Enzyme design. Sequence first.
Site, short mmCIF file in Angstrom:
data_model
loop_
_atom_site.label_atom_id
_atom_site.label_comp_id
_atom_site.label_asym_id
_atom_site.label_seq_id
_atom_site.Cartn_x
_atom_site.Cartn_y
_atom_site.Cartn_z
N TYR A 73 -42.92 -37.41 -3.07
CA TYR A 73 -42.84 -36.03 -3.55
C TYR A 73 -41.46 -35.45 -3.83
O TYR A 73 -41.36 -34.48 -4.60
CB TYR A 73 -43.58 -35.11 -2.58
C1 F43 Z 1 -48.87 -43.03 -1.05
C2 F43 Z 1 -49.14 -41.87 -0.07
C3 F43 Z 1 -47.76 -41.43 0.45
C4 F43 Z 1 -47.44 -40.27 -0.45
O1 F43 Z 1 -46.30 -39.86 -0.64
N1 F43 Z 1 -48.56 -39.77 -0.96
C5 F43 Z 1 -49.75 -40.57 -0.67
C6 F43 Z 1 -50.61 -40.80 -1.92
C7 F43 Z 1 -50.82 -39.48 -2.67
C8 F43 Z 1 -51.60 -39.58 -4.01
C9 F43 Z 1 -52.77 -40.61 -3.97
C10 F43 Z 1 -53.33 -40.90 -5.36
C11 F43 Z 1 -53.72 -42.34 -5.54
O2 F43 Z 1 -54.55 -42.85 -4.74
O3 F43 Z 1 -53.22 -42.95 -6.51
C12 F43 Z 1 -52.02 -38.10 -4.16
C13 F43 Z 1 -53.35 -37.83 -4.88
C14 F43 Z 1 -50.88 -37.34 -4.87
C15 F43 Z 1 -50.75 -37.72 -6.35
N2 F43 Z 1 -49.76 -38.46 -6.67
O4 F43 Z 1 -51.52 -37.28 -7.21
C16 F43 Z 1 -52.12 -37.68 -2.70
N3 F43 Z 1 -51.62 -38.51 -1.89
NI1 F43 Z 1 -52.10 -38.59 0.13
N4 F43 Z 1 -53.73 -37.38 -0.19
C17 F43 Z 1 -54.65 -37.00 0.69
C18 F43 Z 1 -54.67 -37.23 2.03
C19 F43 Z 1 -53.91 -38.21 2.60
C20 F43 Z 1 -54.21 -38.82 3.95
C21 F43 Z 1 -55.46 -39.72 3.83
C22 F43 Z 1 -55.87 -40.32 5.19
C23 F43 Z 1 -57.27 -40.93 5.17
O5 F43 Z 1 -57.76 -41.28 6.27
O6 F43 Z 1 -57.90 -41.06 4.09
C24 F43 Z 1 -52.95 -39.63 4.28
C25 F43 Z 1 -51.99 -38.80 5.14
C26 F43 Z 1 -52.53 -38.81 6.57
O7 F43 Z 1 -52.80 -39.90 7.11
O8 F43 Z 1 -52.67 -37.73 7.20
C27 F43 Z 1 -52.34 -39.72 2.91
C28 F43 Z 1 -51.35 -40.60 2.67
C29 F43 Z 1 -50.68 -40.85 1.38
N5 F43 Z 1 -50.67 -40.05 0.37
C30 F43 Z 1 -50.04 -42.19 1.13
C31 F43 Z 1 -51.12 -43.24 0.81
C32 F43 Z 1 -52.09 -43.53 1.95
C33 F43 Z 1 -52.78 -44.85 1.70
O9 F43 Z 1 -52.09 -45.89 1.59
O10 F43 Z 1 -54.04 -44.90 1.64
N6 F43 Z 1 -52.84 -38.84 2.04
C34 F43 Z 1 -55.62 -36.39 2.84
O11 F43 Z 1 -55.56 -36.32 4.05
C35 F43 Z 1 -56.78 -35.65 2.22
C36 F43 Z 1 -56.38 -35.16 0.83
C37 F43 Z 1 -55.80 -36.31 -0.01
C38 F43 Z 1 -55.13 -35.87 -1.30
C39 F43 Z 1 -56.06 -35.79 -2.50
C40 F43 Z 1 -56.95 -34.55 -2.49
O12 F43 Z 1 -56.59 -33.48 -1.92
O13 F43 Z 1 -58.09 -34.59 -3.05
C41 F43 Z 1 -54.08 -36.94 -1.54
C42 F43 Z 1 -52.81 -36.44 -2.20
C1 LIG Z 2 -38.50 -30.95 -2.03
C2 LIG Z 2 -38.22 -30.57 -3.49
O1 LIG Z 2 -37.93 -31.79 -4.19
P1 LIG Z 2 -36.44 -32.34 -4.43
O2 LIG Z 2 -35.91 -32.88 -3.11
O3 LIG Z 2 -35.61 -31.20 -4.97
O4 LIG Z 2 -36.65 -33.46 -5.44
C3 LIG Z 2 -39.38 -29.81 -4.15
N1 LIG Z 2 -40.65 -30.51 -4.05
C4 LIG Z 2 -41.61 -30.08 -3.22
O5 LIG Z 2 -41.41 -29.26 -2.32
C5 LIG Z 2 -42.96 -30.73 -3.40
C6 LIG Z 2 -44.10 -29.84 -2.90
C7 LIG Z 2 -45.50 -30.29 -3.35
C8 LIG Z 2 -45.86 -31.71 -2.95
C9 LIG Z 2 -45.96 -31.90 -1.43
C10 LIG Z 2 -47.20 -31.20 -0.85
S1 LIG Z 2 -47.27 -31.51 0.94
C11 LIG Z 2 -39.05 -29.56 -5.61
O6 LIG Z 2 -39.47 -30.37 -6.48
O7 LIG Z 2 -38.35 -28.57 -5.90
O1 LIG Z 3 -48.56 -39.97 3.53
S1 LIG Z 3 -47.81 -38.69 3.29
O2 LIG Z 3 -48.05 -37.84 4.49
O3 LIG Z 3 -46.32 -38.95 3.04
C1 LIG Z 3 -48.44 -37.84 1.86
C2 LIG Z 3 -49.88 -37.41 2.08
S2 LIG Z 3 -50.58 -36.70 0.60
#
Ligand code: F43
Ligand SMILES: C[C@@H](OP(=O)(O)O)[C@H](NC(=O)CCCCCCS)C(=O)O
Ligand SMILES: O=S(=O)(O)CCS
Lengths: 253, 564, 247, 432, 432
Positions: free
Chosen positions: D363
């Site tokens: 992010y």
């Molecule tokens: C790559 C990351 C690290 C990161 O920076 N973002 C990720 C992935 C990112 C991608 C996943 C899209 C895809 O599958 O291609 C998106 C949708 C953001 C996007 N780029 O559009 C997202 N997460 Ni994440 N992400 C979620 C969540 C979660 C939960 C999932 C845990 C479980 O048991 O399934 C965990 C965090 C945690 O453990 O608390 C999580 C991790 C992670 N999240 C791990 C990947 C985990 C994995 O390898 O499976 N997300 C959630 O907890 C629920 C909502 C869900 C979001 C999508 C939605 O809101 O519908 C998504 C929100």
């Molecule tokens: C931290 C900051 O990013 P930079 O460190 O400036 O690249 C900031 N992003 C965010 O706060 C991402 C918020 C939404 C995604 C995370 C949801 S938990 C932004 O783009 O201005």
């Molecule tokens: O796995 S991370 O907590 O970094 C992002 C969840 S959407």
Amino acid sequence: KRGLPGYDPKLHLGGIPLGQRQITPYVVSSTDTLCDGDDLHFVNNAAMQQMWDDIRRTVIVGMDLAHETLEKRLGKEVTPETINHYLEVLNHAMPGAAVVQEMMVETHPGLVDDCYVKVFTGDDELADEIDKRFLIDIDKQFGEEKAAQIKAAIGKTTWQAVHVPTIVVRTCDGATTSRWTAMQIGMSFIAAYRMCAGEAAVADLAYAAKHAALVGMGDMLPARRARGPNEPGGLQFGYLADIVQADRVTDDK
Amino acid sequence: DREQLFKKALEIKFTQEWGENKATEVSTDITSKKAKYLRLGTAQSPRKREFEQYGKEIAAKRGLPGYDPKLHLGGIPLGQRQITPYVVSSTDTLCDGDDLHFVNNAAMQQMWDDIRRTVIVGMDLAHETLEKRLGKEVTPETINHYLEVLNHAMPGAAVVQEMMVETHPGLVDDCYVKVFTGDDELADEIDKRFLIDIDKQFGEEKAAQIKAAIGKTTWQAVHVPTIVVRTCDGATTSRWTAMQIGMSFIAAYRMCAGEAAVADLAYAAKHAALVGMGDMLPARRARGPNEPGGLQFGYLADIVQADRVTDDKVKASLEVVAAGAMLYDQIWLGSYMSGGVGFTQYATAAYTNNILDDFSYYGYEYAVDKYGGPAQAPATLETVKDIATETAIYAIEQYEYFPTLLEDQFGGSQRAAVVAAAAGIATGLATGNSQAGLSGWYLAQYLLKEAEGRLGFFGYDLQDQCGAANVFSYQSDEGLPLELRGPNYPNYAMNVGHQGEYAGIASSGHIGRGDAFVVNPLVKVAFADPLLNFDFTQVRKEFAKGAVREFDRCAGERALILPA
Amino acid sequence: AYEPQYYPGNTSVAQNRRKHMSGNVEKLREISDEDLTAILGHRAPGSDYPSTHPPLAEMGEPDCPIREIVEPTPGAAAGDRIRYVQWTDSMYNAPATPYWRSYYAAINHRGVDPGTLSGRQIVEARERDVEVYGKMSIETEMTCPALAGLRGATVHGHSCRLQEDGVMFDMLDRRRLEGGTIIMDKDQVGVPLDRKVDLGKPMSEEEAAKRTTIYRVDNVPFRSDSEVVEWVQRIWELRTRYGFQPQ
Amino acid sequence: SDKVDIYSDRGKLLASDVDIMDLAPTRNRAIRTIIHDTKRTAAVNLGGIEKALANGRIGKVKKIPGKEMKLDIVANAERLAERVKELVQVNEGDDTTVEVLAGGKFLKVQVPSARLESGAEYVSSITASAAAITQAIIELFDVGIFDACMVKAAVWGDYPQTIGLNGGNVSSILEIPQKDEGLGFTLRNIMANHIAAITQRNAMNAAALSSILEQCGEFEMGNAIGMFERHQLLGLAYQGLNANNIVYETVKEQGKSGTIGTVVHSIVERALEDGVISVDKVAPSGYKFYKANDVMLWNAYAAAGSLAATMVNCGAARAAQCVSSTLLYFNDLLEKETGLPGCDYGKVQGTAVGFSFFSHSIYGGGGPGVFNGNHIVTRHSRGFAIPCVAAAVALDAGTQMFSPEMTSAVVGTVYGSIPEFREPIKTVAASL
Amino acid sequence: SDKVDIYSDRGKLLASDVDIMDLAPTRNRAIRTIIHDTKRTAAVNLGGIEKALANGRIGKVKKIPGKEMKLDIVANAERLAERVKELVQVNEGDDTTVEVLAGGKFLKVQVPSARLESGAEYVSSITASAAAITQAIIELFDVGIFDACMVKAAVWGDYPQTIGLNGGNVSSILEIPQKDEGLGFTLRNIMANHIAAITQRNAMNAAALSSILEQCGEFEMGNAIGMFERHQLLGLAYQGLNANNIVYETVKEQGKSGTIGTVVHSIVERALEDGVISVDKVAPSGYKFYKANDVMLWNAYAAAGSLAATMVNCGAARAAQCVSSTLLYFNDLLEKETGLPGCDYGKVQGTAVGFSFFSHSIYGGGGPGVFNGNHIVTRHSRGFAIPCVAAAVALDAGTQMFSPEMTSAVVGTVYGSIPEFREPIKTVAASL
Ligand code: F43
Ligand SMILES: C[C@@H](OP(=O)(O)O)[C@H](NC(=O)CCCCCCS)C(=O)O
Ligand SMILES: O=S(=O)(O)CCS
Ligand SMILES: C[C@@H](OP(=O)(O)O)[C@H](NC(=O)CCCCCCS)C(=O)O
Ligand SMILES: [K+]
């Protein structure tokens, strides 16, 4: 329908409507199209709105620093095969589709079919190995002299021409584009190179896509006319000249 | 025994077939910890099959591929676990989670556009300018003529110059201006087509409270065209509004069309008497006014109107949570500040399956029985500790009594947002103090962490660990009443599963007290308007309409200027 | 002198939390060095640990008084790459909970970078150091091979209903109960291995309930450990009061 | 009154019985001089100007064909430095300095106090330097009316189309005032990489310079008024300036085999021995709930502990990334061990939660080196988090892509050449 | 070397044979003290805080029901001022001042130099004052933990949800640094209404204070380096400080029956008599094209003329709006009369074109009083336009809606109570 009035030509000052003088059309220069001036209002002209959306929804992001992070920091090999697989993954993910997590909900592809990523490179050896579906071939698009000038300026570097969905910048703003682009570049590197899906090296790829290797359409504006990047006020005049492409296909200066 | 309000939804979404997921073969018991994993993948889901089919058409037409379920990691497509639907809370609508993605839901996009395209502009300073500088008389007759002119001009039509080219009214029919005033004598003379009647829209007590706060002042509730804010941005709205207000004063009062007094009307409309939806953001997340990041939590509570039409206090607070979870997490954090697949289910956790409803009604009913009624519990840390602990531990235990509930809200951040929103809203309604509610939210977060040995995603609890200390701090960038906090409050600027829930907590103290508004009475009156495209009295019902592709008040389309 | 107390509470859950924090965890199974390397997926089993290759300008060791008194770990001294071990643990009484795997690492291992999330818990460290941690994370009672799984990506399952065989769902099917034992035949990011790694038998439901660091209303309710609820309320109240005025 | 003994980066006594009020940004002469020099010093990249001119380039990717000018800037560095001094100075013999560094590639310019006294901010260090080098090059190479705009672009970049000198060759340790998140954040907008480069990767001096700048920022923000002055000064002395040798001796005692957890135990043992905390009540299980006899001093011990844990953990791995988790788990475990709030009453732990997320996710953020007290991710603690980040960056042995050698070569060379910046603990104690 | 005689607002000699270098923002002691006091002085609106508390209001329209705390503030202004002084001061007996003004409604707070010396900007004047009054009110009324956030909102407004203290009650003559258009604009972001209110509507002192601040801004921007130092100092002396009595005597000569055009003719006659211009060549029709014998001095005569024409034209109508057209047509007619460029080589005329448009159209701007050197409409000239705007605002007898009495009551009272601000010409001349 509303019980609240709108357009009424008789509300012009004095109850005298537009057209006391002859209302005439316009010829769009270089065309045989004759139209009303109202047909050229940006609100009433979808080509004009789409021109701005195609600029607003575009950023260019370098690949070299991301590839260097994969090689130096993770000891991963970057080859034309890994790049080509990454580009297929990237064109699936960029419009809003999942590649790592289970139970993801996704954008309707029919609403985001204008979204895609192509690549270009000043490294001719790499250009010949990239999957042709995603390549912008500098030699084909520009004449011999211009292609050489572009390659000398770019050097042996590789870039992603990203176009995020029009529906996204319309719902949101131009400052969304570089962030939307970086999120799906990050997901695509995780999936294509089988990284840990969220390790310290992933933050280097995020910093590279959002900041160090980002080439947006324009920077932010000051407080009085505050706006984030990729808005018309930040678009330098030379950038608009480089966006327009008539000089690439006509010798009429 | 109290019957949990979510049980009906869990029975429907897990034990009754949705698409071709063979739900009865997975499990028919919502309390069972085990399920039969059929690994059906794409075949079970008509929605994923629709996306796959469009992906094939797109790849074929462009010669460059797009959506392909098999590009998921390992070549294993989504749906190895049963794909289940969601019940939109308080409705009988059952839909796929993809139908609640903001990109795929026109009701959600229209909700944001109706906020983005709105500003409120005072009339008193403009009328005073006309009197002082030109010696013009302002009467209800001149105001009514001005409002007719304004509703013709505001969408982009001419009133002074010859040979002007104008916007197609068919593309801007969502654009209009209404007025409201705390001057009852003036209200009775305004042309009813343009008036928001405070006495008709609000109950006797609330109307009196609004009038006392507004005084004898008059305001324009302006809604510029959706097509304009979609082509441009929120910072366009106050400028678009001021241009057409200026033209309408020129034509309606026969001023010189461009004299020194016109600049005073411009300064009044753009700055001195402007009441926008939010101010600009700093350099790192730079944006101009009228963007979601500048929208204070109290403003979202005043935009939502369920409390104006229902006496059910919990229901009214949860309609605010639904609007906020969608706007702040799905559109703002999930697109403006990030993008891609985004954050649909981080938000849907707060407006589906009647889960947050069950927890919030439980906590509020507990507080009403113990302290007497809404706004009767003392606003003390002892009360916060009592209500928030009781509500949080009840909510924590529901995920353990119902394995289907835990599987539905599979992410810890989803559980944290809902557990803490219920504790905060029950506390706010009971004390009539939203800051007490906010304190309860942080205590609930800490209880959940120690209970499950986990909380939310990696960075979920930055603001929650900072939280307890910053609720009542008076230090420079720490102290602030919750009503005035928003997505630019430093601790809150980055993370999902908090902002929309905070909008509900901001509303809770005020709903508990029976207040007409939370932070801006002008905003509350401006959105008490049935002509607005989105029905702000029924947020969840509108999201459900958009999910099933039945929302019929979407503005800004360009079908009229595209080939048939 | 000072005797660490770690955490309040008197239930089996609180006792297990202090066991994980203090490192007083029982060894229940064995994994060979090459099988551990294979399932982590960072390098070929049996091969030497690769080194970092930083630019010339960063090769120089600075004159630093802290570097002179903080001994590098074996991995830091060798210049190993930073690698990871990531676990997903079922909420159905998997012995481990994400925060307590991170507390175990923070207390008992040097030079570690633990991360806690709901559906995944990670430790990043210099590769040989992360393997020393990884061995303890998998051989001890902190793991049940059915209720837990090493997952560097596609982690979904911690909060899902268990499969009919009692194993926690894995979208990538890296490990499963095969003929009376848990077999892991893919690395932690889902790449098929050229071997089958035997992680041994799962814990019984009763053993998992007795060894778990998670509270559950149908086992050891969170509400029943009065000192833990009191501790939360005390931290909340004191943080609240000191944030207003630190006195 | 509160007294401390100040100890050096090597654990040696430098000053005894120091009133913490005398270490304040508002009273300490060395800190005032550091801020004065921070505001008046700017870097001119002559090597960058030469390349920009030779290739008609502006920043990393912009290039205007046909605008190339082959001027020998670096070979004339001394001649240009002399002219730049004449243009930047207000009076002959005033406090202006211009020094040629890095074999002619850079100029360290220190504008005279008179430019800051008649200006509202620090920005005359940038504008006087940029105007001076633009004029000096135009004169030395007799640049004509048509081509001077290319010299202007080579120095000032895209300014004024951009708010600042984007893609230019004049920079400072500080960023433009428009990048501040709020009021009083200018001294907080300094990358941790800049601090580690300036202090030559000496982790104690890196934490000290960062703590000084962060607390100058907290004072300018209005977060050190009334009772909060004592609160921030105790944190500055114990975390930033090794008061009573607690940071150094804790790191030495835990350096061979210590972990984040053993540092927690050492700090609790020391707070109890020093009378900072006492047993409040014993629970039926035997768990002891502790009380803080002096809340602000307990906060300061937790700030010193947060830094000592960073040095032990990042030092053992020789890896900066461990700082985000160290700040989180040192404070989380401290609360679980005592029943008392952690550093900054949960705000160091909270900062560390988001910092961990934004240094391991898609992010935003990046490696520890890119963070600073003005960064949205790491601004939340009242100056107690970034000093640990600066120490962690200093302790890294080749794990980072965006290292100080990559991002901070100019600032490191220019400000690192000033002794007060290189050795802040020694400088502060000596000015008493 | 350039010498001038400085004359008073009433055309009386104050100083003879003054080197213009000694009037520079970087050398003149009075200008340096004006900037020092501009940066350290802030206004606390106790009346505003009282009403905000009593009604639970934040700014002009926000109101949180149920938060009313009807604390008695204004009548306790002296007790609160004493406590604010204790909190704002660094040491007992230092240069901190707190004064009660407007019958208790306002406090003038002057933070000690130590807060500016350890900060990067001026903002500690706002933050120390806001934190001090918030703490003083919490103490005086024994405000509890639950209610202190409403005292905070009454003082700081929406901050930190907003970048600044939006809707708060602590302000300065300056605006937050984030509102600067570019580098060096802080001293340029001062409404012309503030200047006219501070100088008690004395048009000469209004032009002088504005010219001082505008030229301090031009110096901080980097627009007074090398040959440009002489350029800006000649403008400061002749336009801002009535050098050689040209402004005052031109206005006196043209005061009874003069127009914009007769002021043009007077200035051309004077420039020719003083040897500033001469005939270059005569066209066949007899029209004389003139040459500037000293370009920078000709620019300064045109700057003095632009101000004298504003005083004659706005003074005759007693109406501020005439300034935009006066600046345009004085310079347009000057060029047509001589064949030489007008003030600032077309930039005063250009600024006046957009200024006229944005003070007579629907698009933005407003009356002359809202403009300033940082305003996008009026920033273009190098400090030669706003001094005329300040004089024009002072000369208005009641035609404006957004007058200094409406927009600048706080600033006008607080800074107007300081003699150097009220009488800048006298103060500058006396410091030589
Ligand atoms: C790559 C990351 C690290 C990161 O920076 N973002 C990720 C992935 C990112 C991608 C996943 C899209 C895809 O599958 O291609 C998106 C949708 C953001 C996007 N780029 O559009 C997202 N997460 Ni994440 N992400 C979620 C969540 C979660 C939960 C999932 C845990 C479980 O048991 O399934 C965990 C965090 C945690 O453990 O608390 C999580 C991790 C992670 N999240 C791990 C990947 C985990 C994995 O390898 O499976 N997300 C959630 O907890 C629920 C909502 C869900 C979001 C999508 C939605 O809101 O519908 C998504 C929100
Ligand atoms: C931290 C900051 O990013 P930079 O460190 O400036 O690249 C900031 N992003 C965010 O706060 C991402 C918020 C939404 C995604 C995370 C949801 S938990 C932004 O783009 O201005
Ligand atoms: O796995 S991370 O907590 O970094 C992002 C969840 S959407
Ligand atoms: C001057 C300024 O307005 P304000 O003085 O700040 O209200 C500015 N408008 C504009 O520049 C309007 C430009 C477009 C209309 C005029 C075209 S000639 C703006 O809104 O930021
Ligand atoms: K838009």
